[PDB]
């Protein structure tokens, strides 16, 4: 399993979307996972983070949650398959989330992997994961 | 509204419980809130964090969630009233959560307030909050 933060470009004053990709998803699927990303609030102002299309839960906001802490310079991602039967597990490669941010400076806006929490398939077995960094104008 | 991390004592090798108190809860209740705490993984090893009795949701784990990041030295608390009607809102003073940790050293084990996210009543109005620090053997 590989998690990749996309690399995009944008002008000062405009709002961009940075996608987070999941690839190499196992057959059993991913029932839950959580991780933290680091960013610079002086370059990028996070307006919101939306669930990707791989989130099969009919009401994505139930299974997907995020917390943003500017002062700490971190973003927390928490995914917990809401059905409780493994029904809403992530089973296909694609877009996991979309970060919406306003570019405040032309300085590079890095979004880097900081730390992983859990990351397990439907049988609650922990998976091997690798993260690739990205950001805006990098 | 005041959030207080309790102060407890314990011996090296034993497991303790540090309670988190909520006081001055408004009439409308608290529908959601999130915040981060800092700790030292060399002194305290967090085994788990359980929802307090003020969490009225019949299945507390639905409305209450936490993430623990040892390397980053932080604990993230996320409360989001699960009914979606304001039914499971926190409406009375009491114990919000209980941190279970194994004491690994007799050095002071501080659990300090780091940053707040949201904190609103049932009408989605943001509340004024103050945090008091605590920990083990402090």
Swiss-Prot record, chains A, B:
Residues 1-138 form the Cohesin domain. It is found in: Secreted. O-glycosylated on most but not all Thr residues of the linker units. The reducing sugar is galactopyranose. The cohesin domains bind to the dockerin domain born by the catalytic components of the cellulosome. Acts as a scaffolding protein in the cellulosome. It promotes binding of cellulose to the catalytic domains of the cellulolytic enzymes. This is Cellulosomal-scaffolding protein A. It comes from Acetivibrio thermocellus (strain ATCC 27405 / DSM 1237 / JCM 9322 / NBRC 103400 / NCIMB 10682 / NRRL B-4536 / VPI 7372) (Clostridium thermocellum).
């Amino acid at each position: 399993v590989v998690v990749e933060i996309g690399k995009v470009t944008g002008s000062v004053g405009t709002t961009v979307e940075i996608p987070v990709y999941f690839r190499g998803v196992p057959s059993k699927g991913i029932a839950n996972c959580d991780f933290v990303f680091r960013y610079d609030p002086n370059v990028l102002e996070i307006i919101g983070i939306d669930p990707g299309d791989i989130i099969v839960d009919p009401n994505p906001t139930k299974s997907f949650d995020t917390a943003i802490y500017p002062d700490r310079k971190i973003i927390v991602f928490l995914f917990a398959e809401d059905s409780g039967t493994g029904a809403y597990a992530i089973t296909k490669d694609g877009v996991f989330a979309k970060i919406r941010a306003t570019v405040k400076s032309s300085a590079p806006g890095y979004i880097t992997f900081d730390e992983v929490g859990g990351f397990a398939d439907n049988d609650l077995v922990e998976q091997k994961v690798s993260f690739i960094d990205g950001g805006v104008n990098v």
